[PDB]
Each structure stands twice: as structure tokens, then as C-alpha cells.
Amino acid sequence: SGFRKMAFPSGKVEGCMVQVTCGTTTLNGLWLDDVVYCPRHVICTSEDMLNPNYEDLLIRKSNHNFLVQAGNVQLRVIGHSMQNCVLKLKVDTANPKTPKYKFVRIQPGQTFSVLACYNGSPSGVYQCAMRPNFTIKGSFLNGSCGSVGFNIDYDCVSFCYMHHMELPTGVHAGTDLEGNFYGPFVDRQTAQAAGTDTTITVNVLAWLYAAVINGDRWFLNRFTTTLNDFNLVAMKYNYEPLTQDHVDILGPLSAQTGIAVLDMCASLKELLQNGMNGRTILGSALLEDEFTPFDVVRQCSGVTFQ
Amino acid sequence: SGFRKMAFPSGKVEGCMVQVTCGTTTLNGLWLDDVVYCPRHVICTSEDMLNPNYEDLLIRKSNHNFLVQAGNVQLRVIGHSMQNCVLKLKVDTANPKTPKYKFVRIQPGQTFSVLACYNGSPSGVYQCAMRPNFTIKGSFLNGSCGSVGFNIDYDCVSFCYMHHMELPTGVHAGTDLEGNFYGPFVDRQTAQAAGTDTTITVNVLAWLYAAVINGDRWFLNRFTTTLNDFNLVAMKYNYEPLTQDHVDILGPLSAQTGIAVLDMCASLKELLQNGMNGRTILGSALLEDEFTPFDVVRQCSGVTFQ
Ligand SMILES: [Zn+2]
Ligand SMILES: [Zn+2]
């Protein structure tokens, strides 16, 4: 029936994208009701150096210095303010395409969709995960700052990510919509060293359950294991240790499939110690960890109206 | 900077999705101006057998038997007709969200975005390719028929695919928006055998150029080859033979990168004969063939308004 890396429908977010220009600098903003949210470094001058005190850079920036447009049409800025690492530009008009929304701060290992945008206009949409070291591995060119990541629960955009910078490795760092960076990262072009790339165990298992639900059966074996035994293997291959909380989340998929969570762990243990035999799983030649148990259930599925 | 499997913004297509019900059966339709397009087998009874003559099944179906809704609101059907394997339902109201659009018939090896839909409402969006054997490897559950695939040139949805059936392998077959199936497939639940899964050579090369543009350099070697020599290797590993036409398309990427097309072919030759050394490329542990040269250029990129 088919399991694909699946993004959320993005039309609701397309309707909120604007471009924001300050001085010379140009990035994207998110227009929700009468507020536009964007990265505060729209105010700088784009280098290493020269003044970093966003506070004092900001003392020099009046409402009329923030130029906010998308589609053709100008928005009038009546107030501004800095909230951690984001700016909130109050505009005189409420976005008529404002969707029901929430801001949340996502947890590591959660997935979300990113609408990549270049100075105000949609480019594309893709799915990714918040990595255990709080980077994300995205697709962001010079211009994409202020692009956002989000989920939709069946009736709602929850916004979870705003893009702010690329690191050395070429991985990506950003904030929630309250302006707080994920991880230790800061909006300043200094070294940071990313952090241990580590694999999201509960997501790999969920994806293995997806493979079975589609007939890519071969990695079923006749073994079982225990949480403590599996976690030894996990802390050799730099996987998240598995807990009973992970086991509980996977409960519906084990019962959806009749395959006990610890039996699936033994399949995974075997795949880790022995690799994939030149074989593949759901057209993947390595283990996949950016589908949550939530993402898998949703994709052999339920919702409807007929 | 980052290269991801990237779908098109889908809000323009979200605005055209409706559900269509006939009898008992329920699938999706595409509402553009005053026409709704949907698979003709919305009229059957959903099995192997019983009457297949879509013509005569259709003689029994009046305008008022076609129930067309999305969001809450009913559309009035004033005419219907069969165009190859699609139905065209004329409705009394033009879709006010009609985007500038075209229908085209895509070529094998071209990619497009699919908006997976379940009886009228958006579920998710993903990117895929039309395979050389004219299947696509998608994610389509019971209900997804009438979901569409499309591209956007910078100002336009060109619709290229409508989903109609799953085959034995669990791969997918469908039509263009004129109702003609891609490949030899027919809207009847009989065996068909898919056809040789064969790899889209020019797309793999384009993706290798993407890897270089991002620093996943290791598969550069000090070899070259010729088209005829490379194509021998291609017809051992079931790759499309490479032609000068493919070489010409890749021209901009070779000059974007300074790496001659035939030198990149020699890198690919080496990867085919020797595998990937347990190494990966753009976080892929196998060669990737559903990015076109068009898709790669667009993703270290150009477009703008600042
Ligand atoms: Zn930014
Ligand atoms: Zn159908």
C-alpha cells in the first residue's frame, strides 16, 4: 500500500509566509493574526563581527525600518519587540489566512515538516526530525532563514521550528517560535561543534513495523532479547537507549502486527551487528530513524468521511 | 547547504481536491474551473468481476448519482462524460481556487509531487518518479484513488498523474489527466506483472553532482570512461543506457561543478562494480535515482525577489 517519507499538507503554512527586510538583509517571516515572527538577526550586517549586541543593533531600528511584504502587497508595522532570538513585528492587519495554530517546543526525535522559503515565497516541503543533539539535517540556502517547521494534528498547525543558521558540518540550528534555540546553539557565526550524531531507536523500530506492514519481511528472525541486553548493543552503535516508555508507545504497532516489541528489538540487534546483507528495507539500504511511531500509524491509516 | 527529497508546495493543489461518491464508492476528484476529474471506476462495484464494461455501467449513471463535496459544501453536477479512463463531471460552479494549470503527459524518469488524499481531504505530500516501466512507487491506501501528481514551473501547476490502482508487487499505476494510463496497465483487477525495475541513470548522475555540491566527495576517482564503455556497465546493472542527450542535460551541472560528465560516469561505474564501502552519500546508503537534473539545479539555486 506504501510507506513514503511524507510531509504534512503545507497550504496552511504557505498562507502565512512573508518576506521581511531590514536595512539590506532579507529573510522570511511568519504572519499569524497581526504579528509577524522572524529571526532577530534580520537586523545585523551579515558577517562574523562588527556589533553583536542585538539589543543595541535594535535600539537603532524603528518600525519603518522593517519592510514586510508577500505577494505584492505592503504590510504596515506599528510595533516591534525582541523575544529571545525572534522578533515580533506587530502589523496593522490580521492575516486573513491565519490557520488555527499553536506554538510548541518539540522533543528530540520528533519529526516535522519544513516549508523551505526564499524571501517570502514557497520553494518546497520536506520532512525531518529533531536530532538528539538538537540539530536538524535540512535543505536551506542563503535566503531560507525564517522558514518554519510544523506539524498538523487533525485541525491545526503547531509550529515547532524557525530556521536560523547553518553550522560547520552543514547541519542546521534554529528556534521554537518563542525564540529559544534548540540545543546550545546561538545566532552568532562562531565555531560550535555539532554534537554526537546518534540514532533515534524508537523511530527505527517503528519503521521496521512499517516494513512488515508492507511485506519487507526478511529481517524477522527467531530471536528475542531484553531491554537491558538490547541497550548494550544500542550503546555500541550510538543508539538512544530503549526504555519501557518507548516500548509503550510502540504498543499499538505491536498489536497492529502481533510482533512483540522485544522480538522486533532482536531483529534490530541482528541488523546492527550484521548489516543488511546487501538487501534493502522499504527501498532503504540503511536503517531509517525519522519516522515516529505516530508517523507510521498515520500511514496505514484511518481518517475519512466517505 | 542541504539537499533533501523535496516536494512542490501543495497549497495550490489542496484547493482543488474534492471527494466524489457514486453509488457506494468513494474516491477523490480534482476540481478545476467547472470540471471535476476522477477515475472512472468510481462507478463500479469494488471487486474482480460482475460487469467491467465501463460504458454500460455508465449508461446507468445519471448526473445526480455523482455526489461531489469538499469542505462541507455540495457541488451540483450538470453533465458527465468518460474520457479514456477518467470521468469529467461538469458542475455549475467554477472552483474559485483554480490555479493557473496545464495537463501534461510526463516522460519516464521524470519526477513529480503527489498529494495523497483520502475522500477529499489532504493527508500528505511526497516526491516520486515515473519509473522506466511506467509504475510509480508511492504511498496509497484504500481511499486514495484520484489523488494527483503534479509539478509547478514558476507560476503553474502542471498535473501529470492521477492515481488508479495498486498492482501485485504493491507498486502503483495511474493515468495522465486525459485519462490514458501510463504504461500497459488497465483499470481492472487482473494480473499484469509489473515490468523490469530499472534505474534512471541520468538522475543518479545528477544526484552525484548534488553530493559534490555539498561536500560528500569521496566517490570522486581519477578515472574517465566513454559513453559506450559506461553503457556496457549500465546494461549489466539494469541502468538506462546513457546517451549524449543525457550528457547535454547534465551540461549545466558539469559547468556548475567543473566535473566532466564522463568523469562522473567513471565514478558511477566504480560505485556500481564495487558498491559503497559501507560509506554513504548524502545520507543515502544506495544510489538515488528520483532527482532529475532539473531537481538538482533548483536545490542549489537562484529564485528570489529580495
Ligand atoms: Zn535567519
Ligand atoms: Zn481510483
From Swiss-Prot, chains A, B:
It is found in: Host cytoplasm; Host Golgi apparatus; Host nucleus. Inhibited by pyridone-containing alpha-ketoamides compounds 13a and 13b. In turn, alpha-ketoamide 13b (tert-butyl (1-((S)-1-(((S)-4-(benzylamino)-3,4-dioxo-1-((S)-2-oxopyrrolidin-3-yl)butan-2-yl)amino)-3-cyclopropyl-1-oxopropan-2-yl)-2-oxo-1,2-dihydropyridin-3-yl)carbamate) inhibits SARS-CoV-2 replication in human lung cells. Inhibited ex vivo by michael acceptor inhibitor N3. Inhibited ex vivo by compound 11a and 11b. Residues 1-306 form the Peptidase C30 domain. The active site is at H41, C145. Residues 1-306 are cytoplasmic. It catalyses: TSAVLQ-|-SGFRK-NH2 and SGVTFQ-|-GKFKK the two peptides corresponding to the two self-cleavage sites of the SARS 3C-like proteinase are the two most reactive peptide substrates. The enzyme exhibits a strong preference for substrates containing Gln at P1 position and Leu at P2 position. There is a cross-link at K5, K90 (Glycyl lysine isopeptide (Lys-Gly) (interchain with G-Cter in ubiquitin)). 3CL-PRO exists as monomer and homodimer. Only the homodimer shows catalytic activity. Interacts with host FBXO22; this interaction promotes the proteasomal degradation of nsp5. Cleaves the C-terminus of replicase polyprotein at 11 sites. Recognizes substrates containing the core sequence [ILMVF]-Q-|-[SGACN]. Cleaves and inactivates human TRMT1, preventing tRNA guanine(26)-dimethylation of tRNAs. May cleave human NLRP1 in lung epithelial cells, thereby activating the NLRP1 inflammasome pathway. May cleave human GSDMD, triggering alternative GSDME-mediated epithelial cell death upon activation of the NLRP1 inflammasome, which may enhance the release interleukins 1B, 6, 16 and 18. Also able to bind an ADP-ribose-1''-phosphate (ADRP). This is 3C-like proteinase nsp5. The chain holds residues 3264 to 3569 of 7096 of the full protein.
